[PDB]
Amino acid sequence: MKITKDMIIADVLQMDRGTAPIFINNGMHCLGCPSSMGESIEDACAVHGIDADKLVKELNEYFEKKEVLE
């Protein structure tokens, strides 16, 4: 599986709930708002000036680890 920054944060959470600590790792604020859950990774990142490039990489690596473990 290959995650992109255009993907929705809430939608990535649908692929795996364990992705939340990764968003939190990069400085995301989990709150009932579009600019955190509803919008795309890049969109929410731009708001808080978060490094979506690193965040997305960690999201990918995470899933691609599971594709080996499972």
TrEMBL record:
InterPro entries: CHP03980_redox-disulphide, DUF1858, ScdA-like_N_sf. SUPFAM superfamilies: SP0561-like. It holds the Pfam family DUF1858. Residues 3-56 form the DUF1858 domain. It comes from the Bacteria. This is DUF1858 domain-containing protein. It comes from Acetivibrio thermocellus (strain ATCC 27405 / DSM 1237 / JCM 9322 / NBRC 103400 / NCIMB 10682 / NRRL B-4536 / VPI 7372) (Clostridium thermocellum). The lineage of its organism: Bacteria, Bacillati, Bacillota, Clostridia, Eubacteriales.
